[PDB]
Ligand binder design. Structure first.
Ligand SMILES: Nc1ncnc2c1ncn2[C@@H]1O[C@H](COP(=O)(O)OP(=O)(O)O)[C@@H](O)[C@H]1O
Ligand SMILES: Nc1ncnc2c1ncn2[C@@H]1O[C@H](COP(=O)(O)OP(=O)(O)O)[C@@H](O)[C@H]1O
Lengths: 180, 743, 743
């Protein structure tokens, strides 16, 4: 799956399709976490479910690439199961927007237009140089809030272009126990 | 399988005394690292014997890290020196005494004819040297009984090779390189000013390097101490040079032994010749004495291997020897290393000198080696064309061809094959462009003056395609049925095998293939079944081992870095293994030896513990296709993520640069040597009718100690057609050995 | 651009007379292929001048296919020979006559001091030689006016280099290799038996190869005909050797010129020395005269390039010369080829012999070359350590370091840098592990005897990492103080450049970086802006040009095959171009020269028309990253499907095998040469305080004819930081040439 270093797409999709494992960047792993997973995939090739699905984040590792992952799983199964590889193209970010986006787009975009209309009336009878004069509106806790792009320099990895703290990582243990 | 048996607690001293030859380091390296593996203490002995007499600073223990990064260097880091204060008991005692002070009960000497004989005596005098040390009370009275027995082992080490106990002595192949290197360079300066050169190779006693080198550069005339010139050679040589100008060979090379002599002990100086040719022919002549450049330089692949194998077989021979067992001198015979009695060997060596001094040259020859006679014969019967009319023609058509991938030193095989044919009474036909040309009609009769000066050229001239004939089995026969072709001589690799194997099919379908055909191993892969060696193999192997040294350069400059090199050679891991052992790779993954992610994981660990010591480098070789999943990329991809933080690593895919450069002296000879005996098997079996039975089409090749013609028919058994490699492969015995030199 | 006005009708004659030096073939190859490109006829003249007198079989036309497959060979295929029957008008006429019979009006002579002067007369006597031929009625009376003007051009060709008209003569670099190759080999045989050797290099007149080679192997003492030894050298030499044994240097190498002399014309034989040392020191000594192995062997990269460029610049000079224009002798001066007057050149050459014979050695030195004096000075001031107490200490701390990728011949730069520093009065500090170690504190003061014997070793010793000095500036500052450093030398590629530049503006910041700093080009890429060359460049280029010949082997053995080799070196296509021209590649795709699917398409066509001729091979080099879309696979993928049916093809990705092996003699010198002048710039600029400006941090490198120190500041202009290559790159001028030669 694509999506820069942000393993969001890779994770949420793996939990939604019931993938045996989704290797994202945000969660390091050695040849052992990989090895100890090929074993679990072998024990499944005994039950009724004779299938296997593993998702990999576009660039979760510079060494362990889609070919590597496949090259290992092939030699390490040889005799118990077959395996192929697919690189989802830009087909993902293309088709008609999902109803949730058709709304999200329209919803939080209006409240972004008012924040403008309202901050046009502020210093009307009264220039902008403060730090809360150019913020980013986005979902935080339960509701959205405007955070000045200034104080966001902290919780942000510019090298990999992913926010430092990412909430959806709490679903990691869960996502996996559901994969056996 | 024998790794268990390992005498420990004991110690061994190693030294070098004699003509410092290349590959000597690669030896003391296998000795130290093996001596430790068995669980014993290994001590260094600088300045050869002199170091023993002295002591103190000339004796130190050696760690695994010590003998590291020396394998790829000539001379000897341990240092060599002639010690006279040892040839006398009055001082031989000081040597012994100094040994007990370090607790050394076993010793390994790497020298020559004399140096070895030195310990042969020390071995005996030991019981007598401890009697004096105990008496005069210079050493603890106890020691007089703990170190009562003294075991020693000698090792072939000198470019002279004036030793008949072993065919090849550590250094030969190396010095041979140095010689050929100088010549191949001189040949370009002579091919211009159209002059004649006289060279003086080393060998005051044995005229070995003088003959092999000559055969390697297709020399005009040679002077050997064992086989002097028949009286009346003065005019016989000018006869040659006089014809070489008439045939248009604007170049003449004369090889002279350092100890040349004629029918009588009368010396044959290189000047006495320079005078002879210029004062009787008028040709411009220049003579040069190849400096000590013959004992120095970088050790060749052959030398490193032989060295590293001897160093081990020596260590085991030391702790596997009894108090009353004769002194052993490890040596490579035939193909497998075997220990031999020291005294009995020095005898043979001295006997050669005896015969020579008593005009018994004829016997002195079959005393230096049972291959030496065959070499001299091969050379001469190939460097002299008895007048066109004095050669009893046989009126038969023999054709040569190069099928398969081009292999260095292949033209050398053709030169021989052609000349040994014309000189035998056959008319020679050359098939160009391998089989592809055979079917097209690319056939042309070639002469003697044609294949002249090929022994030195690499690559192929008659072309060569791995093009299988299995589908053009008609266009071929059709051609032979219009050239009078009555014989065939293929020179290639596995592709050639299938060639003959298929040809034999259309015999009850095409009455043309019903002729004698002999295939000779000619591929860098060495996958040719029915031969432990292939032509052009030792060349690429030398090119690889070299390149790995230049790569171990950038790996040392930048501390903590590992390289993954992918050598070629089909499924045959020959190249991959021999090169890994010759460059001291931490591991070489060949196909013939399966391995899982664990053998790989368990090796990355060893590589990490090395990034702690002094050696912060890493070298791993991988066979072109040893695994369909674990590719050069995979191996690197794993090593990187598994090292991340301890070391860096890159990857290189050796191109065809391997099978390319000028052929190695070992191929320049192999090509010429075992091709002539391939041409006689033809003349001999062609005279039988002067062909049906599935055998007239075999494959001459090195087997045991010597070559033998095996019918392609019975070779179907010991051969893996699926991976194109022989079933049983000898060099796998070096597997355990090769690795214990890793850690 | 200038290829506009060419020339046809007339014909040119090429020959070779003189010391057959390597790369001579690579010369006559460029002459033939170029003379045809211009649209004229080119004829062969065998046996140098003698061929002119004779005629007939010694004169033939040469096709594009002719001069093919000779570039990579030494000596001369045209043949050389000394003709006396030409030094006489009585026979010089037979030569002229034979020329008109073939319609040759222009001539190109590739010889030496004498050979050239020959045509200089022939040029003049021409009008007089046609007067006798017409008179006697031996040539058509008409011809007496059609071929009235005779144009000739000479070309530097002889390993002697006893020519001051050009810095380097076709052959030097090649013979210099042969010399260093022999030495590097002998050094392993001497480092064992701890002995001393005396070598005798070529050069009966000029003592060039005797100085350069010495400087290349860090020799102990040299003997030159231009700068003899000061009276009282006998004891001064023994002083050295006596200390080398005291410093533990178990090796001593002596380099003697073939025509060595002392204060007086009195010759200095190599034996007269062998006697001196052994009869006054007792050290074991062996002297060897390097045979003609100096004129033979395979031509180096530098030689082939220079040769190929001279052959062309000669052709154009022939048809771009007027009937009254002086005889020209093409030669490489500084960096760009320029033609010069023959007579005026021979004068200088003859003047050097004049001075020597009149004990005017002092002037004879500044007459052989303006670099000679600087080389002798460099060597000597680096091979003799005047007593520790006689050196006026400056009490300053200068530190050296290796930043970037390891480049062959880097250690050489450190040896020099260190010694020229201690001998200048500074204490030397060595920074190990490049910057990575600098911040770690891997700093240690080294001495003189420490960096001894490095000029010959490749790779790096002080380690070297591509890590930038940015992120850890503080870990470098604090350390900077701990040792109180004042001067920093750098031996790295583009890496080091970024280093100096990051430390420049980082001064006001960390007040510890305010001191003299000089970097020196040291990368195989040669992307270092502010220098036309780099240390370790000519090495990798030599390994590449070699490997290509070994590949061109397997491409000839198997008819109709094309190879695609991907050389490395960032975006800088230097390596890719020079190697392509040195191996005669059909095309080299570098980044600096854009190209579309058409330039590629229009080249596969040319490759197909070649698969019709004798040359059934194909070689194409591609720069590591010349295009993001057209990769090595792409180029191969196209060439395959576009030839399918005419030729086969494979691909190879040269690994780090390039920047690895022992450094080339040119680097062994470059490293030492331009590194000292870098150390003096420090001693000179540190004594100015008896430091925050754009003129304290510079890059010392080759520019015009000589090197110059350019502040890293003003170098931001001519530099592409996105692709890491200098904006203006000189070697791009050879682009048109390189291509017309290969077609
Ligand atoms: N007969 C001997 N008895 C004892 N030691 C000897 C004898 N001959 C040689 N040696 C020892 O070996 C050293 C080498 O002698 P040498 O004949 O030069 O050896 P090599 O045959 O290798 O050239 C001598 O300095 C001495 O230490
Ligand atoms: N004045 C001259 N007239 C004609 N030929 C000459 C003259 N001087 C030299 N030569 C030619 O050049 C040869 C001299 O060798 P030379 O070219 O000087 O050697 P090198 O290339 O080593 O400098 C002579 O044999 C002759 O063929």
């Amino acid at each position: 799956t694509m999506g820069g270093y942000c393993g969001y797409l890779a994770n949420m999709g793996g939990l939604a399709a019931g993938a045996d494992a989704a290797y994202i960047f945000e969660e390091p792993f050695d040849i052992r976490d990989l090895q100890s997973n090929v074993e679990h995939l072998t024990e499944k090739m005994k039950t009724t479910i004779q299938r296997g699905l593993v998702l990999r984040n576009e660039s979760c590792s510079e060494n362990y690439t889609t070919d590597f992952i496949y090259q290992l799983y092939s030699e390490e199964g040889k005799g118990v199961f077959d395996c192929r590889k697919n690189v989802l193209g830009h087909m993902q970010q293309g088709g008609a927007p999902s109803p949730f986006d058709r709304n999200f787009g329209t919803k939080i975009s209006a409240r972004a237009m008012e924040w403008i209309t309202a901050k046009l009336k502020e210093a009307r009878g009264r220039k902008f140089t403060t730090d809360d004069s150019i913020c980013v509106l986005g979902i935080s806790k339960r509701n959205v809030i405007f955070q000045p792009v200034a104080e966001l320099k902290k919780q942000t990895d510019f090298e990999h272009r992913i926010p430092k703290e990412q909430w959806w990582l709490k679903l990691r243990p869960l996502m996996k126990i559901l994969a056996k | 399988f024998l790794e268990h048996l390992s005498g420990a607690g004991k110690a061994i001293g190693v030294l070098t005394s004699g003509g410092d030859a290349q590959g000597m380091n690669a030896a003391v390296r296998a000795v130290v690292r093996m001596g430790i593996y068995v669980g014993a203490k290994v001590y260094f002995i600088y300045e050869g014997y002199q170091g023993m007499v002295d002591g103190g600073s000339n004796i130190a223990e050696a760690d695994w890290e010590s003998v590291s990064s020396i394998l790829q260097v000539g001379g000897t880091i341990i240092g060599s020196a002639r010690c006279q204060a040892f040839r006398t008991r009055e001082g031989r005692l000081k040597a012994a005494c100094n040994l007990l002070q370090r607790g050394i009960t076993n010793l390994c000497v790497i020298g020559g004819d004399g140096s070895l004989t030195g310990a042969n005596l020390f071995r005996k005098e030991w019981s007598g040297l401890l009697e004096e040390l105990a008496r005069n009370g210079q050493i603890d009275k106890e020691a007089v009984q703990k170190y009562a027995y003294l075991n020693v082992v000698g090792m072939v080490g000198s470019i002279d090779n004036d030793f008949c106990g072993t065919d090849m002595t550590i250094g030969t192949d190396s010095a041979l390189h140095r010689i050929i290197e100088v010549v191949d360079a001189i040949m370009t300066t002579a091919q211009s000013h159209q002059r004649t050169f006289v060279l003086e190779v080393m060998g005051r006693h044995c005229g070995y390097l003088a003959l092999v080198s000559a055969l390697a550069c297709g020399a005009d005339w040679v002077f050997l101490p064992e086989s002097p010139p028949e009286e009346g050679w003065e005019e016989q040589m000018c006869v040659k040079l006089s014809e070489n100008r008439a045939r248009k060979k604007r170049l003449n090379i004369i090889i002279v032994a350092e100890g040349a002599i004629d029918t009588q002990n009368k010396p044959i100086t290189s000047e006495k010749i320079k005078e002879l040719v210029v004062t009787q022919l008028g040709y411009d002549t220049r003579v040069t004495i190849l400096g000590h450049v013959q004992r120095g330089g970088t050790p060749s692949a052959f030398d490193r291997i032989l060295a590293s194998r001897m160093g081990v077989e020596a260590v085991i021979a030391l702790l596997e020897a009894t108090p009353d067992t004769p002194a052993c001198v490890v040596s490579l015979n035939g193909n497998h290393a075997v220990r031999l009695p020291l005294m009995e060997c020095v005898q043979m060596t001295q006997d050669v000198q005896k015969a020579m001094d008593e005009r018994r040259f004829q016997d002195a020859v079959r005393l230096r080696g049972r291959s030496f006679a065959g070499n001299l014969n091969t050379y001469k019967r190939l460097a002299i064309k008895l007048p066109d009319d004095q050669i009893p023609k046989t009126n038969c058509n023999v054709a040569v061809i190069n099928v398969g991938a081009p292999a260095a030193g292949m033209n050398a095989a053709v030169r021989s094959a052609v000349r040994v044919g014309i000189a035998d009474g056959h008319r020679m036909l050359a098939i160009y462009d391998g089989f592809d040309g055979f079917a097209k009609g690319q056939i042309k009769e070639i002469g003697w003056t044609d294949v002249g000066g090929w022994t030195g050229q690499g690559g192929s001239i008659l072309g060569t395609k791995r093009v299988l004939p299995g589908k053009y089995l008609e266009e071929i026969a059709t051609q032979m049925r219009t050239h009078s072709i009555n014989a065939l001589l293929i020179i290639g690799g596995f592709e050639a095998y299938l060639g003959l194997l298929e040809l034999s099919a259309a015999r009850e379908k095409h009455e043309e293939f019903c002729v004698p055909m002999v295939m000779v191993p000619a591929t860098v892969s060495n996958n040719v079944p029915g031969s432990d060696f292939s032509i052009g193999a030792d060349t690429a192997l030398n090119t690889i081992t070299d390149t790995c040294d230049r790569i171990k350069q950038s790996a040392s400059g930048t501390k903590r870095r590992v390289f993954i090199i992918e050598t070629m050679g089909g499924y045959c891991g020959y190249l991959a293994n021999m090169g890994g052992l010759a460059a001291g790779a931490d591991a070489a993954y060949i196909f013939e030896e399966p391995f899982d992610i664990r053998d790989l994981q368990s090796n990355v660990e060893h590589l990490t513990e090395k990034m702690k010591t002094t050696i912060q480098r890493g070298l791993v070789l991988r066979n072109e296709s040893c695994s369909e999943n674990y590719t050069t990329d995979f191996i690197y991809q794993l090593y990187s993520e598994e090292g991340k933080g301890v070391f860096d690593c890159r990857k290189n895919v050796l191109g065809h640069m391997q099978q390319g450069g000028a052929p190695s002296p070992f191929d320049r000879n192999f090509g010429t040597k075992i091709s002539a005996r391939a041409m006689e098997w033809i003349t001999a079996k062609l005279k039988e009718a002067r062909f049906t039975t599935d055998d007239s089409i075999c494959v001459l090749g090195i087997s045991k100690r010597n070559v033998i013609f095996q019918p392609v028919a019975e070779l179907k058994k010991q051969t893996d057609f699926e991976h194109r490699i022989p079933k049983e492969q000898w060099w796998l015995k070096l597997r355990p050995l090769m690795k214990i030199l890793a850690k």
